[PDB]
Amino acid sequence: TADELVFFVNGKKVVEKNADPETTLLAYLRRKLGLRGTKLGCGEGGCGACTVMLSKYDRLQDKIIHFSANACLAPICTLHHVAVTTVEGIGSTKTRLHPVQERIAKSHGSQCGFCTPGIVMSMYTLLRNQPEPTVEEIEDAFQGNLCRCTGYRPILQGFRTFAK
Amino acid sequence: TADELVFFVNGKKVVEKNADPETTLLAYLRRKLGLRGTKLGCGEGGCGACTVMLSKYDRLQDKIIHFSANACLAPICTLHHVAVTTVEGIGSTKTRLHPVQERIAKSHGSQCGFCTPGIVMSMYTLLRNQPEPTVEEIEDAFQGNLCRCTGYRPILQGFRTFAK
Amino acid sequence: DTVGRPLPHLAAAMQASGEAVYCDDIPRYENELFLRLVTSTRAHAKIKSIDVSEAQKVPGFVCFLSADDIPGSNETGLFNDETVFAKDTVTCVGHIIGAVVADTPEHAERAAHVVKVTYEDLPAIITIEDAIKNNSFYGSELKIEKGDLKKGFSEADNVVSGELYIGGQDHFYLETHCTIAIPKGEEGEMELFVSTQNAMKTQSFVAKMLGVPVNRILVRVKRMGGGFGGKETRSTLVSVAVALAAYKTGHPVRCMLDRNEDMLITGGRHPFLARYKVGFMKTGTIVALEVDHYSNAGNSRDLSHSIMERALFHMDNCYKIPNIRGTGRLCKTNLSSNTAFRGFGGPQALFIAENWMSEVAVTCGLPAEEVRWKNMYKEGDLTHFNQRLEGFSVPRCWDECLKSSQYYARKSEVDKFNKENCWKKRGLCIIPTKFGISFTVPFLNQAGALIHVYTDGSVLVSHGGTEMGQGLHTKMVQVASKALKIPISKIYISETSTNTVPNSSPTAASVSTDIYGQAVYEACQTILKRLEPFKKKNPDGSWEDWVMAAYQDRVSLSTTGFYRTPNLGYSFETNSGNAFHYFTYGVACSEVEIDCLTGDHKNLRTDIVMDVGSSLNPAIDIGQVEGAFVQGLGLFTLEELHYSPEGSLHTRGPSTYKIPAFGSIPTEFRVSLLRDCPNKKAIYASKAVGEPPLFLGASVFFAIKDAIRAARAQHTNNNTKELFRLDSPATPEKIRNACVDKFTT
Amino acid sequence: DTVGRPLPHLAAAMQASGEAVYCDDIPRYENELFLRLVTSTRAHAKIKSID
Amino acid sequence: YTDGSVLVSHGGTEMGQGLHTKMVQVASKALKIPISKIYISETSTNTVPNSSPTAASVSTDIYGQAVYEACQTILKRLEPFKKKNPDGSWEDWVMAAYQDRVSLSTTGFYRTPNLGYSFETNSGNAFHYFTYGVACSEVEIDCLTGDHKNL
Amino acid sequence: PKQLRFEGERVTWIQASTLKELLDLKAQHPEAKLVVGNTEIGIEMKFKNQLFPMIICPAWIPELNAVEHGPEGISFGAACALSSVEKTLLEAVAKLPTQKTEVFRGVLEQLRWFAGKQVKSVASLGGNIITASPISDLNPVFMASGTKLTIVSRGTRRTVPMDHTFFPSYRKTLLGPEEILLSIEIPYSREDEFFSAFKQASRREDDIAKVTCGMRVLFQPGSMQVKELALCYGGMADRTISALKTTQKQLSKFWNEKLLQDVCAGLAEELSLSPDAPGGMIEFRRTLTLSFFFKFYLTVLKKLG
Ligand SMILES: Cc1cc2nc3c(=O)[nH]c(=O)nc-3n(C[C@H](O)[C@H](O)[C@H](O)COP(=O)(O)OP(=O)(O)OC[C@H]3O[C@@H](n4cnc5c(N)ncnc54)[C@H](O)[C@@H]3O)c2cc1C
Ligand SMILES: Nc1nc2c(c(=O)[nH]1)N[C@H]1C(S)=C(S)[C@@H](COP(=O)(O)O)O[C@H]1N2
Ligand SMILES: Sc1ncnc2[nH]cnc12
Ligand code: MOS
Ligand code: MOS
Ligand code: FES
Ligand code: FES
Ligand code: FES
Numbered sequence A, B: 001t002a003d004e005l006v007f008f009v010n011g012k013k014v015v016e017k018n019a020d021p022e023t024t025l026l027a028y029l030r031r032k033l034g035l036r037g038t039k040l041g042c043g044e045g046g047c048g049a050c051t052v053m054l055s056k057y058d059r060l061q062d063k064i065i066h067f068s069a070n071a072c073l074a075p076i077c078t079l080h081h082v083a084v085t086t087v088e089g090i091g092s093t094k095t096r097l098h099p100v101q102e103r104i105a106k107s108h109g110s111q112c113g114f115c116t117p118g119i120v121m122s123m124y125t126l127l128r129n130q131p132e133p134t135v136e137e138i139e140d141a142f143q144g145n146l147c148r149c150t151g152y153r154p155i156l157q158g159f160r161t162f163a164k
Numbered sequence C: 001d002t003v004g005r006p007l008p009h010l011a012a013a014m015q016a017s018g019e020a021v022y023c024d025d026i027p028r029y030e031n032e033l034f035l036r037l038v039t040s041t042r043a044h045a046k047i048k049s050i051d052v053s054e055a056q057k058v059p060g061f062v063c064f065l066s067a068d069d070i071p072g073s074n075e076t077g078l079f080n081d082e083t084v085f086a087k088d089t090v091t092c093v094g095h096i097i098g099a100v101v102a103d104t105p106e107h108a109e110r111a112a113h114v115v116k117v118t119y120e121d122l123p124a125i126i127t128i129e130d131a132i133k134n135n136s137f138y139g140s141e142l143k144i145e146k147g148d149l150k151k152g153f154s155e156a157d158n159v160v161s162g163e164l165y166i167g168g169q170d171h172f173y174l175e176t177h178c179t180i181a182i183p184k185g186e187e188g189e190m191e192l193f194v195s196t197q198n199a200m201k202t203q204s205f206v207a208k209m210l211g212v213p214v215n216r217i218l219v220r221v222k223r224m225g226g227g228f229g230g231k232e233t234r235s236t237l238v239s240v241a242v243a244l245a246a247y248k249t250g251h252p253v254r255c256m257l258d259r260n261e262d263m264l265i266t267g268g269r270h271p272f273l274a275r276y277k278v279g280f281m282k283t284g285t286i287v288a289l290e291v292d293h294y295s296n297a298g299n300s301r302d303l304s305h306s307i308m309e310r311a312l313f314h315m316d317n318c319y320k321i322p323n324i325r326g327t328g329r330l331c332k333t334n335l336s337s338n339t340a341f342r343g344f345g346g347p348q349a350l351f352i353a354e355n356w357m358s359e360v361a362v363t364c365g366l367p368a369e370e371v372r373w374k375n376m377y378k379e380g381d382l383t384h385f386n387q388r389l390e391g392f393s394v395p396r397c398w399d400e401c402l403k404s405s406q407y408y409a410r411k412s413e414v415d416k417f418n419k420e421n422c423w424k425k426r427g428l429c430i431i432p433t434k435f436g437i438s439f440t441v442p443f444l445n446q447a448g449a450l451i452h453v454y455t456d457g458s459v460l461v462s463h464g465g466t467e468m469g470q471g472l473h474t475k476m477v478q479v480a481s482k483a484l485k486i487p488i489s490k491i492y493i494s495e496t497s498t499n500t501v502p503n504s505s506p507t508a509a510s511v512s513t514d515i516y517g518q519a520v521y522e523a524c525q526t527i528l529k530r531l532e533p534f535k536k537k538n539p540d541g542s543w544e545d546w547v548m549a550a551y552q553d554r555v556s557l558s559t560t561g562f563y564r565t566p567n568l569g570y571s572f573e574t575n576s577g578n579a580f581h582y583f584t585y586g587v588a589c590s591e592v593e594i595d596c597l598t599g600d601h602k603n604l605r606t607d608i609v610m611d612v613g614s615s616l617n618p619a620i621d622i623g624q625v626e627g628a629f630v631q632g633l634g635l636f637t638l639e640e641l642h643y644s645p646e647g648s649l650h651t652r653g654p655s656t657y658k659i660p661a662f663g664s665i666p667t668e669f670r671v672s673l674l675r676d677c678p679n680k681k682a683i684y685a686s687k688a689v690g691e692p693p694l695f696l697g698a699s700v701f702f703a704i705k706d707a708i709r710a711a712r713a714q715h716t717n718n719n720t721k722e723l724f725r726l727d728s729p730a731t732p733e734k735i736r737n738a739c740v741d742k743f744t745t
Numbered sequence D: 001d002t003v004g005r006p007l008p009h010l011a012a013a014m015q016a017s018g019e020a021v022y023c024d025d026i027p028r029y030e031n032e033l034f035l036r037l038v039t040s041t042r043a044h045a046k047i048k049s050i051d
Numbered sequence E: 001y002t003d004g005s006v007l008v009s010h011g012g013t014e015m016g017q018g019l020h021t022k023m024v025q026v027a028s029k030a031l032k033i034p035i036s037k038i039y040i041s042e043t044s045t046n047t048v049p050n051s052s053p054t055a056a057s058v059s060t061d062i063y064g065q066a067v068y069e070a071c072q073t074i075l076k077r078l079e080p081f082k083k084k085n086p087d088g089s090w091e092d093w094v095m096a097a098y099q100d101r102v103s104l105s106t107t108g109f110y111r112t113p114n115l116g117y118s119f120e121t122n123s124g125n126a127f128h129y130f131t132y133g134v135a136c137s138e139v140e141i142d143c144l145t146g147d148h149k150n151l
Numbered sequence F: 001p002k003q004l005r006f007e008g009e010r011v012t013w014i015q016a017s018t019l020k021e022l023l024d025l026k027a028q029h030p031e032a033k034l035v036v037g038n039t040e041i042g043i044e045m046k047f048k049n050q051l052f053p054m055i056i057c058p059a060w061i062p063e064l065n066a067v068e069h070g071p072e073g074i075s076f077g078a079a080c081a082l083s084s085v086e087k088t089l090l091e092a093v094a095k096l097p098t099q100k101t102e103v104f105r106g107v108l109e110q111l112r113w114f115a116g117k118q119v120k121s122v123a124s125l126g127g128n129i130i131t132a133s134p135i136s137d138l139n140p141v142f143m144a145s146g147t148k149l150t151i152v153s154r155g156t157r158r159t160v161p162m163d164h165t166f167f168p169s170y171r172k173t174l175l176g177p178e179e180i181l182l183s184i185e186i187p188y189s190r191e192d193e194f195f196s197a198f199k200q201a202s203r204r205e206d207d208i209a210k211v212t213c214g215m216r217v218l219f220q221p222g223s224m225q226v227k228e229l230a231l232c233y234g235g236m237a238d239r240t241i242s243a244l245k246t247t248q249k250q251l252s253k254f255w256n257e258k259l260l261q262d263v264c265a266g267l268a269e270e271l272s273l274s275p276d277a278p279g280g281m282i283e284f285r286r287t288l289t290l291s292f293f294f295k296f297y298l299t300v301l302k303k304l305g
């Protein structure tokens, strides 16, 4: 008497047979699937520690679209046939880092490290929509991402390397 | 299309809705109920490390009967309306130790300690059947219990205090 | 040998891939339960009943916990004036009454929200003003006094007096408080994984509450996603609560706070009220000063006495003042207990000093840089607390900052911009700072390390300090590598634990690199000595050879190491003996543009010259300067806590509390470390960096004030030599209202 | 000062109550797996396939 | 620790022989405090590195000695406090050493002396000393079955 | 592509695949809640404490996602994300002449420092409107321009320009219980028509006391004589309000120093707050309402003589 929810996380199929409408994506990734890359910073949409990339084929537009989103507010029930990418989906110290990850690390753009997964997924979303962005597009991709350690200079300086 | 299994463990009700006929009691206490007092020594009925007490009302006899048994061989499926007592059921350092536990401890009858819960349950069963046993009944209650550390003398000396 | 090289933080790569583990990232046991605090909704009241019948209907519910369930002691806190769980009477809005335990954190949240408490209200004290008139203080007046105050004032050309307020600040570490507690079932043993800077007191407080020797309790700390002082003591509120739940249920238990819970419960920085009077000459030379400080301490003592002490020690900034009395008082109020926050009372006292200073410049009608400079200490001067200033490098820092910021040239531009613009103004200010290095409590200045070398020649280091992003472990690995003369890839640090280094001070006061650096260094020397004979027997072999011959010859490859800071011990009578080991110095210059019609502003440019002696890692150090400064710019301009009349906090998330963002920072942001200035007094000639820079953000505050003055000169009156009151933080409300014009009126 | 006195083994009481923890008595993680060795049935031989 | 409780750790493991019990009895006599003040929790490679396997019957001898050396070091550091407050308790001396920034942690180590037998030369000590004993037993056998009683 | 059902401990969720399916459901269940981005509903369930046992998700429906370019203006489906609206409007603005895009440039301004990309990718247009926050940055702009709303139910269908009557009390809108918002038409500006939008920087309480506004003036052909005037403000009351009494008085008047004076006197007077008004900041807010107009007043002049 209840439908199955079917979505994708890091290219792998998830078939939820007993979805609860109250379940957040954040809670599902951490506590059901065991992927703790994505973090809880506030639960109310303002810090971005929980940023993921969403992908879907737009039945209207005809295209595949990639956009960023707060896992703490996304109900898993809005995600039937959506694809999720988390920080562990784009690279790893066990295999190879994605350039976004490499650059932020080596530019001293990470200190305590708790907001880094979220900033990495905001930059990566920007790159998948626009492979060669402007400095201006770069600064703007971060309005929903907070960091309390760095004062921001080293993160922009490191990512500005992707522009022109 | 499958019946519920109902039994008691340490005076508390267990309602098993999906009993598998292959499941041993030993596995059920340890891995389903989290009570690890009862130990795996051999899996074939020779060592007694897994000894428990079983209690039932005998529909023929008219009485309640108490007898000891090997948890490693007892299928949970033979246990509908049976009461299980384990080492954690008779006494604890958190509340108070049963005299069986006290006397073995203080008589130096426990060294590595792995066989002690099972020896404890054999003595206790004997006492519930016969509050004042002979020396002979005592020696005999242990043919199914092996100890590799103590050479037995101190366990008999300690327990022989319950006789005449 | 990497000491002095820009080596990235050792965990940075794993932080960027999501592989580094924080406390709540640790997997759960199959039987692991969840805790949620139940908290007061009243400032001050008798508890008349607690009803849990609704909470019992929630699926997964396990039990409610309260003061009755405690086997040991419900007496806690740094001075033993706190309860673990409140008994009959609550004393602030987030006060802890009990806890709920359930099978999921969702179930815990749902059950806690539904617990009914009945209260009978008692009259309350919230403000500093309320505390003064009701005389509500902890302990008695603190004081420092030098010279002759009468006489000072009797020879002054001029006097100025007034009142200043500075609001508090929430820590907003990106990761909130968090504990896991695992009960063993033997002998009271318990192992805890916790986000704290003070594994020592966590262990003490848990054991006291339990009624159990300290040797039963293991506390382990891998890393913190931020601390900033808010994890020096206040993390025990969650820690002890969770321990009790594990004791009582016999299961593993955890709890991570939601933001809204963290801001209400765990405390922030002390707000300060100041009443001041300065006497000076026509030249701008200072000649007498008198300050009474009041802090808002909340419903317990905690660290409030020490914070007041560091404030009094800093009321001079970089200025020589021959006649001076500073006093301090701690206000006892019905609000969450305030505690350590980066600076520790130093930024508050420093801000009060720069405010009267800016009023002396305006009253005299002289330029500010000139009045600030005339009044500086010189090499070798004593402070108001009679400590000698050696290697006093503010004059250098000042000079290079003026030159590389092009201060005077850009000052002309500002005046020009102000003559040509009507409803927008610009400001430019330049500010010095000094900061004393050491715990003001002599006995906390101790540190231990424990090093093993294994038979493969790999080395495990463990010290009393914790990682919270500041790069402490990175630095100790650089230290060990240089001391032992082997590459960093042979050395590892895993975690901080009470069973490898005991009795350790909280990771605080900015001294960690100094003290643990030294302790790690002593352990290395002992290892080198023991290895020496084998090096002589095989001069042309490798590290691995010497280690394995020492092992086969039954020479031990394990040793402790210890350090104790020398010659510390200031007295409040006598007014003497050193309170600090040395001082850290810097200078910042900032420029802003305000919108007079909205209260909005832009940070156009900032230049900083900071003295950190010879840096162990320029990249970490420059990172520490930028972080600290931006948090200061938050304290003085953006960030504001706001309560109801009844003492209840309104600001509880990122949407009502604004910490600096990507676009908050100055468009042109420039930091230099001063060159050629080794510190004789600390490891490899370096200096503490963590807290000293934060105060320099005030340069943005005083650039904004300078811009309010020119707006005022445009639209209000003709009294250049006019003083007006501007409190911290200068939000847009404060900025617009101060720009009195044809609309405000 | 107990040196020379018949002091019982310090864990004896908790061995007698089943509260003393041995290795398999440690609780399992929610994701914890299990292993079983696969072992030779010959004294001496070439392994020609594993299916 | 600052409450005056002590955590001991050594390279040896418990397997029923009572090693920990004996180390606790040793520590207690060496420090002169009751046994209820001392605890051992487990054996771990991050507290004592490079240890020999618990074997050859020497564990009590060799870990006893090492525990004994650690205690001496503790007593020496606590000595000046004991002189200042000769009628105080253990707890008082511990807390005054702490507040005066004297460390309350130490290693301890022992190396058996004069060992090293040679298969050439046929000399040098192989053992530190010898343990000795004597047993007498009586049995009854059943010559028809192979069975026996130990009398 | 069909309708899906999810059952929870407390909640039933229906994903509607079709306009029909939705209107049927809103008819059978008038108390049900519509969820698109969850950036409001999620907050009410976690913090403000609500429980809504029945939720309907209309995101899949085309119509509600449609973007249409008519002669009167541009129409957006109610479920269109804020970044789609932004993207479409940036494009119309880089392509049509200035005199036609004054309302569009207002909307884009309110959308400048309005949350981050993550939120703007899932927040729906219809969601911001129907939530009816006293501090909504979009409603004041929509009101001052009479942006047209298409409202629909099983049976009914109507198109009203938004005006002051659309928000009757704290957090309610003039829709019936069975109704849904279907689409929103943002107008082109005409000849002699000018527009501005402004918002107070920070923010301190949840959904009160943040001054935000939309401002519109229409002149007689080629002249400087007012024909219509609209000034709508958020953060001044418990809903979006218009300064009707003040603007009404300026009809026929000329754009000069004296007009500046009377609207300020009119605003100070019409919008005043008691000293104990919720949210505080009493003088600052008043000053903003005048100051925002002063800016508008100058911006219009620069755009004429
Ligand atoms: C961190 C953050 C920052 C924000 N900043 C701002 C800001 O700066 N300015 C501002 O104005 N707002 C701001 N908001 C509010 C935000 O823009 C709204 O949450 C959003 O637009 C609502 O869209 P939604 O689809 O997510 O609404 P939902 O949460 O899904 O639902 C919202 C309401 O609209 C109703 N609804 C939705 N569709 C229809 C329909 N078509 N017909 C009838 N009713 C319908 C629902 O029943 C529900 O009651 C912010 C929110 C967050 C999370
Ligand atoms: N990234 C980061 N930097 C930080 C902190 C933090 O929590 N995160 N804490 C600050 C504070 S309050 C102090 S006291 C020092 C403490 O560490 P140290 O003694 O090793 O500098 O780090 C400072 N820098
Ligand atoms: S001075 C100082 N600074 C920071 N933390 C402290 N704790 C105790 N004294 C302190
Ligand atoms: O001394 Mo840092 O913890 S404020
Ligand atoms: O030497 Mo005993 O371990 S066989
Ligand atoms: S957790 Fe802060 S935005 Fe999702
Ligand atoms: S590094 Fe600590 S929050 Fe960004
Ligand atoms: S395990 Fe040896 S008999 Fe049951």
Ligand code: FES
Pocket: B109, B110, B111, B112, B113, B114, B115, B116, B146, B147, B148, B149, B150, E016
């Ligand atoms: S004590 Fe070791 S087996 Fe009996």
